């Protein structure tokens, strides 16, 4: 068996715990929502489990059996889900408020439904990435177009207004650039994106300087993060009121709200421009997972570092209520971890499910 480790506020357990129930599935991805998480299996099925259930027993998400799912998404402060099929179809379910499901109404859905706006597309118009905010959604096509939809407050969708959209809408401001990553926030939310030239963009609410251009002014269309504009950034992430960027050469920058040590720089001052996370210099980071107020980082050599809030034991290596600076979690160096994920009070890490790796 693959190893799947979890810790934090988990209701099935009487530090880190081995989740054999999840290992049986062959985990490739985990998307953490607010009360539950989705698990994608090697065979392209999707399962769901609540954090606070008495029993660990992931249940099959019905309505996807037809298709081979290759990506899932959800947001750690959210109540809706996206799933992406190998053939390109996008499914959505959960809460419908503000049009976040993308079906042109605000009806909530117990079961996955195809977003017909993305069906019947031709080649480079196929969706290849999906993302959720707390109240909105995004997707990227193979050509590099970015579509957003859902709640529009503070310009989080990037279309020059605060209008909600129940149907996916092209982000015109990036038309002409190839978008390769996007991340969505919560509360008064920011949105971040990365284009193939390695430049980085932000828009939405400006509180705590999470947009990365000083002060706290928001904006309603995508704008360049000038401090990152010479680095080859390849991924972005959003936690609650803060932002993360990761370079091709494994450096990490965090900025935004400072409370509860969520930025990892060692104090709780808000940081209004992207700042290099010194605690990880020397390590080559290959992924970062941002929960609400805590983060994990996976390195090339398979170490798993964490920092931030510890109000709910998100960090099993510290007794104090925060973990100010990044530091390797013990026990995990020897397990060949390849994936990490964070919920609002939860963290997961897994090794590979190839029966060959085992």
CB 327 within 8 A of CB 320: no
Cα–Cα dist 315/306, whole Å:
7
105, 166 Cβ separation under 8 angstroms: yes
What is each CA distance from 110 to 76, 80, 113, 337, in whole angstroms? 19, 10, 9, 33
Side-chain half-sphere exposure of 307, counting CA atoms within 13 A:
23
- Residue 125's SS3 state is helix
- DSSP-derived 3-state class of residue 288: strand
- Which tokens in the block code for residue 19? 């989740």
Residue 143, phi-psi category: left (phi > 0), alpha (psi -120 to 50), beta (remainder): alpha
In units of Å, what resolution does this entry have?
A: 2.6
Quote the CA–CA distance of 236 and 138 in Å, as a whole number: 14
Q: Experimental technique used?
A: X-ray
Query: DSSP states of 238-255 as a string?
Result: EETTEEEEEETTS-EEEE
CA–chain centroid gap for 34, Å, is 12
Phi, psi of 123 (to 5 degrees): 60, -100
CA dihedral 265, 239, 90, 38 (to 10 degrees): 100
User: What is the DSSP track for 133-155?
Assistant: -SSEEEEEETT--EEEEE--GGG
278 is written with which tokens?
A: 């010194």
Give SS3 for 346.
Answer: strand
Distance, in Å, from the CA atom of 306 to the CA atom of 177, rounded to the nearest integer, reads: 33
Q: What is the DSSP letter of 23?
A: H
If one counts every other C-beta atom within 10 angstroms of the C-beta of residue 111, the result is 11
Give the tokens for residue 84: 């992406």
In a 13 Å sphere around the CA of 142, the CA atoms on its Cβ side amount to: 10
Cα–Cα dist 223/226, whole Å: 9
Question: Looking at the chain, after which residues does the C atom sit over 2.5 Å from the next written N, breaking the chain?
Answer: 14
| Domains of the chain, each with CATH number or no CATH | 1-358 (2.130.10.30)
| Side-chain-facing half-sphere of 206: CA atoms under 13 Å | 13
Q: At 98, list the tokens.
A: 């503000």
Asked whether 295 and 342 are in contact (CB, 8 A), the reply is yes
Q: Are 324 and 315 a contacting pair, CB within 8 Å?
A: no
User: Which long-range CB contacts under 8 A does 223-229 form with residues at least 24 apart?
Assistant: 224/199, 224/200, 225/199, 225/200, 225/201, 225/274, 227/273, 227/274, 228/199, 228/200, 228/253, 228/274, 229/199, 229/200
Q: How many other C-beta atoms are found inside a 10 Å radius of the C-beta of residue 336?
A: 12
Residue 236's H or E segment, with its range, is strand 233-239
First vs last C-alpha separation in the chain:
6
Closest CA to 254 of 206, 205, 307: 307
CA distance 151 to 173: 18
- CA-to-CA distance for 211 and 204, rounded, in angstroms? 8
d(CA 145, CA 162): 21
* Tally of residues, the chain: 358
Reduced to 3 DSSP states, what percent helix, strand and coil does the chain have, rounded to the nearest 5?
A: 10, 45, 50
CA of 255: how far to CAs of 10, 86, 92, 195, 280, in Å? 29, 35, 31, 19, 15
């Amino acid at each position: 068996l693959q190893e799947v480790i979890g810790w934090g506020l988990i209701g099935w357990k009487y530090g880190p715990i081995q989740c054999e129930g999840l290992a049986n599935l062959g985990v490739t991805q985990i998307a953490c929502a607010e009360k539950r998480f989705l698990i994608l299996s090697r065979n392209g099925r999707v399962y769901t489990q609540a954090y606070n259930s008495d029993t660990l027993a992931p249940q099959l998400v019905q309505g996807l059996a037809s298709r081979n799912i290759v990506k899932i998404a959800a947001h750690s402060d959210g109540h809706h889900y996206l799933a992406l099929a190998a053939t390109g179809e996008v499914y959505s379910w959960g809460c419908g408020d503000g049009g976040r499901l993308g079906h042109g109404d605000t009806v909530p859905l117990e079961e996955p439904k195809v977003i017909s706006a993305f069906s019947g597309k031709q080649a480079g118009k196929h969706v290849v990435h999906i993302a959720c905010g707390s109240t909105y959604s995004a997707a990227i096509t193979a050509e590099g177009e970015l579509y957003t939809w859902g709640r529009g407050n503070y310009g989080r969708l990037g279309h020059g207004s605060s209008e909600d959209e129940a149907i996916p809408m092209l982000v015109a401001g990036l038309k002409g650039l190839k978008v390769i990553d996007v991340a969505c926030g919560s509360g008064d939310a920011q949105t971040l994106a990365v284009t193939e030239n390695g430049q980085v963009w932000s828009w939405g609410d400006g509180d705590y300087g999470k947009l990365g251009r000083g002060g706290s002014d928001g904006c309603k269309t995508p704008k360049l993060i000038e401090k990152l504009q010479d680095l080859d950034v390849v991924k972005v992430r959003c936690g609650s009121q803060f932002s993360i960027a990761l370079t091709k050469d494994g450096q990490v920058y965090s900025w935004g709200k400072g409370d509860n040590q969520r930025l990892g720089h060692g104090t709780e001052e808000h940081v209004r421009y992207p700042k290099l996370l010194e605690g990880l210099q020397g390590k080559k980071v290959i992924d970062v997972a941002a929960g609400s107020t805590h983060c994990l980082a996976l390195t090339e050599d398979s170490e798993v570092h964490s920092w931030g809030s510890n109000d709910q034991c998100q960090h099993f290596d510290t007794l104090r209520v925060t973990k100010p600076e990044p530091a390797a979690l013990p026990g995990l160096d020897t397990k060949h971890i390849v994936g990490i994920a964070c919920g609002p009070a939860q963290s997961f890490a897994w090794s590979s499910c190839s029966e060959w790796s085992i």
